[PDB]
Design a binder for this molecule. Structure first.
Ligand SMILES: Cc1cc2nc3c(=O)[nH]c(=O)nc-3n(C[C@H](O)[C@H](O)[C@H](O)COP(=O)(O)O)c2cc1C
Ligand code: SF4
Lengths: 129, 432, 62
């Protein structure tokens, strides 16, 4: 079908030598693959649906002139979005980044009952409505 | 066969024979008028027979909703799950224009008490809590005195009427909230909390007062049950139209010559009821402007509709209103119809429990717009705005108080839009 | 104690409304001290009595 004369390459994919990233920011960084925690000030859950990859925080110092926050870390604002955990781990492995993976924390199903607010002999009865 | 015209009810068919309090209201007076007669035999026939009679009679709730009473009392006809079963009689009587429940308590406080026993027996309840308006202090006392006599005569309490059935009747007074007439808000008040209605589908027949099965029934609904059980459901069904069976108490107030409270057969023509019993409209049946046929909750209807409309649930529903509590409020042509309905919306803004959003904010919003329509300080385009705001309250609230505040506004804009617009032109040309 | 016995055991909080009214009948109005005293005898949080006192119009808080 695919008449292209393919070859065989039985080694793990690795593109660290062709991505142009300096050695300092490959072997010393620590990627963090995680599903962002819900912002506790809001009840919305639309920002907890994709996996992110962020890097370890590094020093920020005050600019002597204006007091602005300065950085020497080129990857400080880098956030990558991935559809699944396996996709994120694949991207980190081929770039030569050491990574920590945190399994998604999903809310457990809860048994809600408006009627329990007015129980005859249980402590779920509320004193105010 | 069936009848076509209704009214002219004979005194021998009336149930509240001491409505005007011209005979003894104590136990001896009640018994001489048939109350507490052969009550033991009613109890011994069991809940099924009592529930059957109410079903056959076609009785419907007299509190304002008009659900089939016989069908509503059968939810408590279930085995016991270990919890006590109670009956809550709704004597709050807070609907503007409504005074019927005051007379039953103050002048026949033994049909109500007997009704509790018969109604309680049907539901299998252990006791009845009667929630009476807090302003009705004197009426609550007569109710207590009658309850004391019933206890001393063995009619209630342990071994009620010699039937082996134990039933206690308690009276709990409110504290001045119209919302406590709502069945669930009444229950929350008995439990010591604010008068805030509960949500459904946890129904009072499953989780009610103290989290127990309960039935909330109006005083009139409960005060006619013993008579139906005696004279039969067939007798009661002989009055009114089909599905509107029974005799109904009426409060004719407002711009009538002789405002009064009378009993009359259901389906009675509205014109006949005012003319025959209330002495007609002030200035004859040509000074009539509009009528509120079922208390403030129901929309008004203009003179044109009042010519032939009949006082029953189905007929008034077809007239874009409701029977409600049968509290007829009559307004003549000297009335400021906009101002009359503005005061009703101010009433609902002072009686909103404040729990749910649409009536906490919406009713207070309708009140301010109405307060400007009265003065005409508004544009005609705000009438449709007021209509839409009304439809956002109706059906989106926990309880029907929100619905009862939307309907009066809708009635005003349905039949008297020309009056509202004219009021705005007068203001516009004056306050250039 | 007669009012408190009109309600099932374990639901003494049902007596706030009649016992608050009784306090007002004796006194003529409801000072904050009166509200607290009703909370003590019924073993109900004081804020729950304040909710009842402020909700119903008949209670006089002045
Ligand atoms: C805002 C509001 C006030 C009410 N006030 C009363 C009342 O004063 N007396 C009454 O019997 N029903 C009142 N009801 C109706 C009750 O919720 C319930 O429908 C009725 O008491 C049930 O008893 P019934 O079968 O005799 O109608 C009110 C409903 C609402 C929404
Ligand atoms: S509609 Fe009004 S009175 Fe009824 S529960 Fe909602 S806020 Fe309370």
């Amino acid at each position: 079908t695919r008449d292209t004369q393919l070859i065989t390459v039985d080694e793990k994919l690795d593109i660290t030598t062709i991505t142009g990233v300096p050695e300092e920011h490959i072997k010393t960084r620590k990627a963090r693959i995680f599903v962002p925690a819900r912002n506790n000030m809001q009840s919305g859950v639309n920002n907890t649906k994709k996996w992110k990859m962020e890097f370890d925080t590094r020093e920020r110092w005050e600019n002597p002139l204006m007091g602005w926050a300065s950085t020497a870390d080129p990857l400080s604002n880098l956030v990558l979005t991935f559809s699944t955990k396996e996709d994120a781990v694949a991207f980190a492995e081929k770039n030569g980044w050491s990574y920590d993976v945190e399994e998604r924390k999903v809310p457990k199903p809860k048994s809600k009952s408006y009627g329990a607010n007015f129980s005859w002999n249980k402590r779920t009865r509320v004193s105010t409505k | 066969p069936k009848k076509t015209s209704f009214g002219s009810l004979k005194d021998e068919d009336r149930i509240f024979t001491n409505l005007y309090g011209r005979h003894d209201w104590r136990l001896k007076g009640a018994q001489s008028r048939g109350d507490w007669y052969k009550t033991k035999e009613i109890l011994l026939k069991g809940p099924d027979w009592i529930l059957g009679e109410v079903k056959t009679s076609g009785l419907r709730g007299r509190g304002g909703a008009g659900f089939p009473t016989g069908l509503k009392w059968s939810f408590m006809n279930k085995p016991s799950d270990g919890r006590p079963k109670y009956l809550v009689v709704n004597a709050d009587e807070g609907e503007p224009g409504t005074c019927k429940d005051r007379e039953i308590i103050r002048h026949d406080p033994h049909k109500l008490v007997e009704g509790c026993l018969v109604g309680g027996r049907a539901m299998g309840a252990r006791a009845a809590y009667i929630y009476i308006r807090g302003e009705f202090y004197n009426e609550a006392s007569n109710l207590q005195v009658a309850i004391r006599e019933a206890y001393e005569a063995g009619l209630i309490g342990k071994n009620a009427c010699g039937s082996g059935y134990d039933f206690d009747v308690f009276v709990v007074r409110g504290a001045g909230a119209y919302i406590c007439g709502e069945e669930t808000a009444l229950i929350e008040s008995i439990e010591g909390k604010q008068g805030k209605p509960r949500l459904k589908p946890p129904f009072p027949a499953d989780v009610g007062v103290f989290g127990c099965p309960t039935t909330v029934a109006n005083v009139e609904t409960v005060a006619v049950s013993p008579t139906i059980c005696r004279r039969g459901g067939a007798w009661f069904a002989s009055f009114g139209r089909e599905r509107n069976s029974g005799t109904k108490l009426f409060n004719i107030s407002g711009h009538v010559n002789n405002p009064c409270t009378v009993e009359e057969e259901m389906s009675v023509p509205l014109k006949e009821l005012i003319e025959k019993h209330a002495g007609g409209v002030t200035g004859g049946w040509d000074n009539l402007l509009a009528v509120i046929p079922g208390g403030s909750s129901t929309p008004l209807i203009p003179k044109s509709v009042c010519e032939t409309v009949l006082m029953d649930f189905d007929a008034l529903i077809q007239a874009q209103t409701g029977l409600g509590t049968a509290a007829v409020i009559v307004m003549d042509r000297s009335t400021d119809i906009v101002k009359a309905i503005a005061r009703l919306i101010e009433f609902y803004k002072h009686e909103s429990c404040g729990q749910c959003t649409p009536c906490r904010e919406g009713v207070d919003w309708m009140n301010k717009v109405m307060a400007r329509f009265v003065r005409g300080d508004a544009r005609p385009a705000e009438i449709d705005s007021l209509w839409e705001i009304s439809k956002q309250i109706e059906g989106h609230t926990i309880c029907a108080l929100g619905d009862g505040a939307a309907w009066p506004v809708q009635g005003l804009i349905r039949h008297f839009r020309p009056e509202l617009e004219e009021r705005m032109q007068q203001f516009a040309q004056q306050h250039q | 104690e007669a009012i408190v016995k009109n309600y099932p055991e374990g639901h003494k909080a049902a007596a706030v409304l009649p016992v608050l009214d009784l306090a007002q009948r004796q006194n003529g109005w409801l000072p904050i001290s009166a509200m607290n005293k009703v909370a003590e005898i019924l073993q109900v949080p004081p804020m729950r009595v304040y909710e009842v006192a402020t909700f119903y119009t008949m209670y006089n808080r002045k």
